[PDB]
Amino acid sequence: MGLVPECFITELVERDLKEGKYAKLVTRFPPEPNGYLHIGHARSIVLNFGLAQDYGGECNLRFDDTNPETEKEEYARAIEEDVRWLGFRPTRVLYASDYFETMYQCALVLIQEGKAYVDDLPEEEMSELRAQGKPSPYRERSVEENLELFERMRRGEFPTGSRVLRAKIDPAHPNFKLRDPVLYRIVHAPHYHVGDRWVIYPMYDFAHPLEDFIEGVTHSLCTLTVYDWVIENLKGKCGLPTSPRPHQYEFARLDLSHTVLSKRKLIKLVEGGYVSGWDDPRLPTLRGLRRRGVRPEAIVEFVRKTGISRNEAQIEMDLFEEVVRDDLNPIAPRVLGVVDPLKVVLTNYEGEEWIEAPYWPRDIPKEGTRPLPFSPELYIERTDFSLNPPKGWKRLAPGQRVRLRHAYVIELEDVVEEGGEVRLLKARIVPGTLGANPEDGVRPKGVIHWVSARHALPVEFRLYGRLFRTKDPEEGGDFLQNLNPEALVVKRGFIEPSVAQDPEDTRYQLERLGYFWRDPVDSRPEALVMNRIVPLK
Ligand SMILES: [Cl-]
Question: What residue numbers bound the domain in which 183 lies?
């Protein structure tokens, strides 16, 4: 039923809704269009749109775009793509920057009422004074002089960084952030959305409340005072409504083990070439995860399962992989492919045959079948063969027989070597071990996967592992020195031919290897390329 974990915020919203404090709930998700979203942002997405649908309310996708230097439309498009990918349907799509006029008007009002002033001091002097908690000399300029300067700022008469509009609050305030914080700055740069109209742009702390207020947001949810000051001094001006007013509430950042999320670090991994691109399945971007093969349902489940709170415990990657596995288990038909192929010839078998093999294990309700080709030549995993097997060895070796999955039992006859490593197995079927045990009672200790070398399809396999070996690379030192050099292994293996008649977005479990699907970018019917979404436990 209820999508968002019982937590501080549901109970809170429920209270306010029942008691009538707001008619509809109205949340927003506000990313800055200056990058790609990542698994962290999923929490803010699920929470904000989740809230809306649970309570018959509205949720705005809004680009908080007040930083003309970095922000681009493709980042916006990309954001919307990812939001809708997760299954969510913004009530509206909005751009902070379409409210730039209203914001500038709301500034005039501040200057008029003596609540803000232009500051000529250079940045380094402003912060030294702030640290001393003393006032700018320019702090007590008249209304008139300020309006005239701000206007000259608007016209682009001053260059970038040279002048700022600031709130007149308290420079000796115990809270640093309230020491006359900056409302407007100057950037001589064009904005991707609104073009060249503006040369002065509001700061986060001034634009955020106003964008909320303009939208009639009720609950403003951000991760872990100036906000209030902006609302309380402007309620009822510039034809913003006099009430109700939005209220900030705070949840904790998602910090996932074995993964970095800081945009600067991610930038270092792409640019550094440590990763092939922003949708690289090694990355925790939503792009990457999509292309990896994770389903939006698992990310949303992951997000729910982990809860919403002030509780900032680092989430274990095991959990995520665990969720992705559970996600796919009812819906990944089971097929057989081999990743590290060693050939196996059968000396006592001729011709071909096709076996009705089941897609689903006993315990999945689904029925389903495919013709699986058998022949005298197969590939098995090199790793399912030991010349010197350990005590628990359940697979092929010189003494031991082994179950070919869905097919015969076989036992080893000859091993052929070259360069001192192992290049081909000569083996024999134990007849008629098909669908049955061996006459002699000695069953194989184990079952291994395999394909017919006479029928199999080449596949390029991209085995993705976790990006880092250390639990906390994000705060650990040289995070680069913590990369997992196994993050991607590429092997050229083979898969059963059935897969050719599957829609291309099919996700498989390849038995005893993990979950896989055609990489949406590179794979082609005549040159398959499949990513391993996740291994088994
Ligand atoms: Cl079997």
Answer: 101-204
